[PDB]
Ligand binder design. Structure first.
Ligand SMILES: Nc1ncnc2c1ncn2[C@@H]1O[C@H](COP(=O)(O)OP(=O)(O)OP(=O)(O)O)[C@@H](O)[C@H]1O
Ligand SMILES: Nc1ncnc2c1ncn2[C@@H]1O[C@H](COP(=O)(O)OP(=O)(O)OP(=O)(O)O)[C@@H](O)[C@H]1O
Ligand SMILES: Nc1ncnc2c1ncn2[C@@H]1O[C@H](COP(=O)(O)OP(=O)(O)OP(=O)(O)O)[C@@H](O)[C@H]1O
Ligand SMILES: *[C@@H]1O[C@H](CO)[C@@H](O[C@@H]2O[C@H](CO)[C@@H](O)[C@H](O)[C@H]2NC(C)=O)[C@H](O)[C@H]1NC(C)=O
Ligand SMILES: *[C@@H]1O[C@H](CO)[C@@H](O[C@@H]2O[C@H](CO)[C@@H](O)[C@H](O)[C@H]2NC(C)=O)[C@H](O)[C@H]1NC(C)=O
Ligand SMILES: *[C@@H]1O[C@H](CO)[C@@H](O[C@@H]2O[C@H](CO)[C@@H](O)[C@H](O)[C@H]2NC(C)=O)[C@H](O)[C@H]1NC(C)=O
Ligand SMILES: Nc1nc2c(ncn2[C@@H]2O[C@H](COP(=O)(O)OP(=O)(O)O)[C@@H](O)[C@H]2O)c(=O)[nH]1
Ligand SMILES: Nc1nc2c(ncn2[C@@H]2O[C@H](COP(=O)(O)OP(=O)(O)O)[C@@H](O)[C@H]2O)c(=O)[nH]1
Ligand SMILES: Nc1nc2c(ncn2[C@@H]2O[C@H](COP(=O)(O)OP(=O)(O)O)[C@@H](O)[C@H]2O)c(=O)[nH]1
Ligand SMILES: *C(=O)CCCCCCCCCCCCCCC
Ligand SMILES: *C(=O)CCCCCCCCCCCCCCC
Ligand SMILES: *C(=O)CCCCCCCCCCCCCCC
Ligand SMILES: *[C@@H]1O[C@H](CO)[C@@H](O)[C@H](O)[C@H]1NC(C)=O
Ligand SMILES: *[C@@H]1O[C@H](CO)[C@@H](O)[C@H](O)[C@H]1NC(C)=O
Ligand SMILES: *[C@@H]1O[C@H](CO)[C@@H](O)[C@H](O)[C@H]1NC(C)=O
Ligand SMILES: [Zn+2]
Ligand SMILES: [Zn+2]
Ligand SMILES: [Zn+2]
Ligand SMILES: [Zn+2]
Ligand SMILES: [Zn+2]
Ligand SMILES: [Zn+2]
Lengths: 562, 562, 562
């Protein structure tokens, strides 16, 4: 590795075509790609740096309801009138989610003692020996005891040490008690912060009347909601959900750009139902949970249990805030360049397809409209230089009677040449700038061939004739003796390379002979690549040998050039 | 398709330039790109596979406070001394967030009954008929009834069935009761898990003194905090926030690499305020909520209601853990390759710009410093081979008096040729390796042109002259008769392709005549691509025709080659 | 900017190689890349648009337990038998997480008053002057007062205004009270929604027996779990965790494709422990908290405090739903194209490596197996066209005695030429299609050189000789006088370009002389690029000058061509 090898810059080589069709196609594709990427950049705001948000939600529910119920306690039933305020139908969860009671089922006066279990469907027992001591299972309000007692006249149930009077499995009461909760109100206060952009805002703005209510079109940016409207917008019925509660969800979409020329950051409110739309025959249809209020009277602990059915609103906050940024632009321009190669790849594909040489056969005479596209063939000739790898089996042969050249890339295995065939190939056209300057063996149709002198193993390659059919030989013409066998022209060609060589040298003869071989190939096999592997016939070879003979040893043959 | 077509590998063709400037530019750009990508890989740790974390947080607040307040109950007021412990100013939320009370406002002795409403601002009523029965609205503590009663001497308000004595709307008491909460302490225990890397850890380490407090510099990794310092770090005031509570937020950043040579995983604590910086005249400035304690005495249900103002800390855990991975390296090396094309594209752009041929006119003589950059023009000649598509309208004309060639890609519409002009173009230089080998019509300035014999529609194309101005003809020279009209040289050129054709053939004459046309084009239009579409003048054409005449039919004209 | 310069389409230029090895390598690499991308597309389902989920969880725990404990109140101890039901060991959290009590430690009969503090380890005090009034610290149940009192006979402690009888710091009681909670049951109801795909579903399906239990293999899709099995699957022990509680975690993985031909969406349940694996000597091992139950009797407020140790389950729901989408396919096909260049880059690298020209020296004779790979050199000759930039220092020299050409890109600084050396370079081969056509100064070894006439500063460049060693001159041959000094051939070469120039012109001589210089270069420096910068010796120069002399002024020298 030398210093001169470090400064070498390597550059691709191209060809330029002046055509209206390809130019129009190229510019159309470039313009539409530019339009697409610009539209995407302007729509999606890819020039902006986007960042997620940090949210904080606070909720306040308001409303009152009345209830009238035949309540039981100590075996005494009586109609009681009660009121439910905010502190009674809500629990202090203090988060994004909040709860609202719509129906309840309570049992009061409970105290820890022995009592019979309420006989449910299939829990009857009229045998004191059937029960088992200290056995617990789900759907059981207590621990079982070996004894037995009657729950009522003509009723027999197992004893249990638990809270008594034990709660009895009841379905939810329909119509609900707190169906009036369809008229309650909510207030949702959301503060959102983009830290990276250093922006903070809130859904509430100055001047809003607090006696407002959210409507989809009338008053959209009023954070106060009505619990009936949330179900009305979707199509659900609150009076049916109240009996067996169900989960609801609110979504607050924040999408805005923190640019001075376009600064609108407002929340969009949406609603969704997360629970399954349950019906009769469903398995687990309702949302419910139990909770107790403890107390004591006359030195004895007691509780009041409440199974509460009610909705649950799961607030969901998601968004992204964008602001102008310069590096994202550069990142996008870096990506567009790969897309910009469509015209190049498409037009190259069109050329390579239309230069197949099969279209001239059938599709062109059939259609009769795509004729001038044959022009593309010319482009291929000015774009693709086809070659072939050199190998010892590579040979070329030309016959004067035929117009084309025959390549041979196969071993002989003793067979005589010109009896084996190979893929045809056409000869190239001569550079006209220089052209303007001006008895016998069985395998010879020429009559003038000679047998080979090489060994019996390698001589079959030398078996050849100038003409494949009989009638004429190449060496009988005059151009042959003018070009090849002219000693003066060959001496001139040798002087053109080495002008100071001596013409009286003894070993000069062979030198001339070598040139004569090339002087044949260039006549027939024009290309130097095709001429290095060309093989002369026997007649021309032995003519040249008799004009330029060797005496010391036997003649050699086709030596591999490398 | 063919088998020989499947093994064909297609390779791009390039040119190699030995220049110090381009080499230095190339290597500079390569080195700086390498430096940038290596710096990015080392800084961002892109060689690592990253994974998010799974967190579990637990909190414990500790501290005590005293309160002295004139409490009311049953119309009896008296000064009472009370204590607030951990179980009193907190609620069992059991999550990431937790709550602390800083101010309260309570009403005790409530019972469900009829009572008057407390007259708020604008809720006075001195008319029994004005009220409506069975009406509910927000900001109302109960259901209204048609009756009316006096709340006090000289006071008249509406009756309601609700909890009595009904709570009266008051502002938050200032100074706050639990301002002492600025000295309470917190303990935060966070456990994090990276499942994919299988790494579990915790913020607490062995040996930390439990009698520590968080400081930004003194003792950073002490998870115990002080509620006053959290506000003091930001610049807030706890005494002003205690009156109307506000939300606070703690952030715990985990960023660490699970590599054996670099293993430091420690949390970073940060603070932020999620609520708005509220002040006077704001609408909804305070965090608060209501909760109730139920009980009963002498067989009657009662409750104690508490409107609580306090802060709410929202703990936020975000992080990512990285560990060494081999495939990410490969993915990054795969991406660098597209970036590495900067030198190529930039230098090619420089060449294409400096080879515009306009710089030689104005900018070079003006600046007088970018002269040697004209060298780049040569590179263009060795890089871009320009061509033109063949079409029937395509024609080339050359006049001996002018030095350049005239292209014509436009229809004639009956106009005589050489009266219409087209874009100039220079002739290519001859391959010197071969060059070293050695009355009249109105539209002719040459005096030797002849009229055309083609039809009247298509003959105007043949109208031409050798010279555009008068004075001389081409056929008067000697090189003309040496090259074209020499029967021997043309016969030799025919033998060079088909050495066995007979010179006695009657149809050979026309053959020779065809060659003569090419022998003119190659003399003037050197390139074969240009020579195939060249057009001879009339004088030379008819000279060639008289030397090689036809008798059977009329002569044809310029046939399209393909 | 011309119009014709807008329709110019630029196309890369290539060379096509016919080789079995490179074709096989190309197709192998293409097929394996195709296989890889297809396998990735089928495995990762990249043909689908994926979307995250929106989840809603609801829990219900069931089970009962009994406790027998020597409970204390008012200095009276007695054995008490209690029961714990669903409302007694759970708290209404109503979220993803839920809590279960496994151990408790309670203190009842508390009332706000003055009492002594329980003497802990190191909190003794036998001196009334040591205490301080109005001092609060953590680990203290109340505010300290200056007075002192005895907690018991032979015990002295500080007085405090707080809840009395004050709770005493105790360790967790082992064995736990609610170890029976290993046999409780849970029910988890999860509803998921994919909005974009518009698909709602639930883990529960019709027909499941509600008397089921989750098993990893037997009954996987039974959402009922047993709290002992959750620990048993991992390897933990519930009885050891129940004393000092710890956090557990459930994970629900939804991975499914919403395609009609493949529609299976079922949850996978997994378990994990989020808390640390704690043992003896650890610092903060347990999850616990405190909560109180308030009441009043005989007109006096009271509370019962409970320190609860228990587990906390943190349900975690993550997943992604996929459905078929057409644009993602196009996006993937767009990405594969960059990958497809492997064969091209690899084979070009192989060619550029094997064409280094160093392999022929050492590695080939050593290995003796990679000989035919030398063939690749030929490809390089058909691919890379090496050139050199023109500059005023660039010169070329050739000596007939040597076979190669010497490049010189260095300033002389007054030194005589042919005494300075430069990098060698071989001469290119002649186009054989045209080749078939047919006293003295100190620094001259030729004997025929002349001194220079240029100024003393610039004449050293002209100092040169044809032969580097003595014995022969070039101008003594016959080819020299046949090519260069032949007035007729030069006149013909001039007529070949400008056929109408007059041979009687006085200024024609110099013209011929100029041509003679070129007629030397093409003889020795075959390329036109190398010939434009070639420099003649003195002997040939002055021979040409004597055959074509100038009389008016002194002869100039080598002028820069551009
Ligand atoms: N769901 C709600 N529906 C209607 N009005 C509400 C609602 N929630 C709060 N408000 C009213 O809007 C205003 C803002 O409530 P905010 O909590 O900020 O003040 P407040 O004095 O603490 O409320 P409160 O009436 O409970 O004392 C109050 O006048 C309040 O009466
Ligand atoms: N905010 C806090 N400030 C100061 N010390 C604390 C705080 N929280 C907990 N601790 C102390 O740090 C240690 C760890 O608390 P941990 O809950 O693990 O044990 P503990 O004995 O159950 O707590 P305790 O009985 O005091 O309620 C305890 O000694 C505890 O007193
Ligand atoms: N952990 C659980 N273990 C066993 N069974 C349960 C469990 N949770 C609920 N169930 C049973 O499965 C069914 C579904 O419970 P669901 O809440 O939907 O109805 P429910 O009548 O309100 O339940 P219950 O009144 O017994 O509390 C019920 O029969 C219920 O008894
Ligand atoms: C919405 O569903 C509720 C059920 O909760 C419907 O309530 C019934 O309405 C019909 C009127 O068609 C009355 O005849 C019934 O008396 C109502 N049920 C009860 C229990 O009172 C309600 O009708 C539905 N919405 C509308 C607009 O009808
Ligand atoms: C922080 O804000 C509080 C208000 O809550 C300030 O409290 C007052 O401090 C001034 C001293 O400048 C006293 O004169 C007032 O008596 C304080 N207010 C009350 C109600 O007592 C406090 O001053 C502020 N911080 C500092 C350092 O002054
Ligand atoms: C799981 O851990 C528990 C500890 O909570 C072990 O309980 C002990 O089990 C051994 C049996 O090897 C008994 O001798 C002890 O009496 C048990 N401890 C108590 C307090 O009763 C339990 O053994 C462990 N699991 C197994 C399978 O042994
Ligand atoms: N293309 C081609 N080259 C040949 C042929 N015959 C000989 N050559 C070359 O000519 C040389 C051998 O010629 P030859 O008559 O045997 O003389 P020798 O070397 O003294 O035996 C070698 O350099 C061969 O490469 C032929 O038939 N075709
Ligand atoms: N480039 C060029 N080719 C010509 C011109 N004239 C004739 N040719 C070719 O010469 C042939 C016609 O020659 P022509 O004298 O008409 O003989 P004809 O074919 O017997 O009528 C055709 O192959 C033409 O393509 C010309 O003016 N310029
Ligand atoms: N490559 C090369 N070109 C030369 C050389 N000498 C002269 N030229 C060219 O020939 C012209 C000068 O020839 P010269 O004998 O000085 O005649 P002058 O122009 O009347 O002075 C210029 O155009 C030179 O570029 C030489 O030695 N080598
Ligand atoms: C001549 O030899 C016949 C041409 C053979 C080349 C065939 C090229 C086929 C190209 C098809 C590509 C279509 C575009 C598909 C994009 C997804
Ligand atoms: C000769 O014909 C004049 C040259 C015309 C080509 C002009 C090319 C302009 C290229 C500008 C590119 C600047 C870099 C922009 C990167 C974002
Ligand atoms: C001839 O002058 C010698 C050839 C010099 C070229 C050396 C090219 C080395 C290429 C190494 C690339 C290996 C693959 C690495 C992939 C990560
Ligand atoms: C605000 O709107 C409400 C409801 O629409 C109505 O009372 C009135 O238009 C406004 N009230 C006040 C107080 O501004
Ligand atoms: C630990 O630090 C604390 C507070 O700084 C101090 O009491 C002492 O330096 C250490 N205490 C113990 C018990 O190690
Ligand atoms: C369902 O399964 C349970 C438990 O395996 C068992 O009682 C029985 O196989 C089925 N019971 C019912 C009621 O379908
Ligand atoms: Zn023969
Ligand atoms: Zn023959
Ligand atoms: Zn004329
Ligand atoms: Zn003329
Ligand atoms: Zn000399
Ligand atoms: Zn000499």
């Amino acid at each position: 590795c030398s210093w001169n090898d470090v400064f070498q810059y390597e550059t691709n080589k191209v060809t330029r075509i002046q055509s209206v069709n390809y130019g129009t196609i190229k510019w159309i594709l470039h313009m539409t790609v530019f339009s697409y990427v610009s539209f995407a950049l302007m729509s999606d705001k890819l020039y902006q740096r986007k960042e997620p948000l940090i949210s904080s939600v606070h909720t306040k529910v308001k409303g009152v309801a009345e209830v009238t119920e035949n309540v039981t306690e100590g075996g005494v039933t009586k109609l009681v009138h009660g009121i439910f305020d905010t502190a009674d139908y809500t629990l202090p969860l203090q988060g994004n989610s909040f709860f609202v009671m719509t129906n309840y089922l309570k049992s009061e006066g409970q105290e820890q003692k022995l009592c019979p279990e309420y006989p449910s469907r299939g829990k009857q027992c009229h045998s004191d020996q059937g029960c088992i001591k200290g056995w617990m299972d789900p759907q059981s309000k207590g621990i079982q005891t070996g004894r037995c007692i009657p729950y009522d006249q003509k009723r027999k149930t197992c004893e249990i040490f638990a809270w008594c009077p034990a709660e009895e499995g009841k379905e939810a009461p329909r119509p609900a008690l707190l169906r009036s909760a369809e008229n309650f109100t909510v207030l949702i206060k959301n503060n959102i912060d983009f830290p990276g952009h250093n922006y903070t805002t809130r859904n509430i703005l100055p001047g809003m009347n607090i006696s407002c209510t959210f409507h989809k079109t009338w008053n959209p940016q009023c954070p106060i909601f009505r619990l009936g409207d949330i179900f009305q917008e979707i199509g659900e019925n609150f009076t049916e959900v109240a009996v067996q509660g169900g989960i609801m969800g609110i979504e607050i979409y924040w999408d805005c750009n923190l640019d001075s020329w376009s600064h609108r950051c407002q929340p969009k409110y949406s609603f969704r139902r997360l629970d399954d739309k349950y019906t009769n025959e469903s398995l687990f249809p309702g949302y419910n949970f139990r909770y107790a209020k403890y107390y004591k009277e006359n030195g004895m602990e007691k509780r009041t249990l409440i199974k509460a059915f009610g909705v649950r609103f799961d607030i969901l906050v998601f968004g992204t805030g964008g602001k102008f940024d310069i590096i994202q632009l550069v990142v996008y321009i870096g990506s567009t360049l790969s897309y910009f190669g469509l015209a190049t790849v498409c037009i190259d594909l069109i050329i390579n397809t239309y230069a197949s040489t099969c279209c001239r056969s059938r599709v062109y005479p059939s259609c009769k409209c795509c004729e001038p596209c044959a022009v593309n063939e010319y482009y291929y000739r000015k774009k693709c230089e086809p070659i072939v790898e050199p190998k010892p089996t590579l040979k070329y042969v030309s016959f004067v009677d035929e117009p084309h050249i025959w390549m041979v890339d196969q071993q002989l295995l003793g067979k005589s040449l010109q009896d084996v065939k190979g893929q045809e190939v056409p000869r190239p056209q001569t550079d006209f700038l220089e052209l303007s300057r001006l008895d016998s063996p069985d395998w010879c149709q020429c009559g003038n061939c000679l047998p080979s002198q090489l060994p019996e193993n390698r001589r079959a390659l030398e078996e050849l004739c100038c003409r494949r059919k009989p009638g004429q030989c190449i060496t009988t013409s005059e151009l042959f003796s003018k070009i090849v066998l002219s000693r003066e022209a060959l001496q001139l060609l040798l002087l053109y390379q080495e002008p100071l060589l001596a013409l009286e040298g003894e070993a000069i003869n062979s030198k001339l002979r070598h040139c004569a071989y090339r002087s044949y190939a260039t006549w027939r096999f024009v290309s130097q690549d095709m001429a290095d592997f060309a093989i002369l016939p026997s007649c021309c070879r032995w003519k040249i040998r008799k004009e330029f003979p060797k005496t010391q040893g036997q003649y050699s043959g086709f030596k591999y050039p490398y």
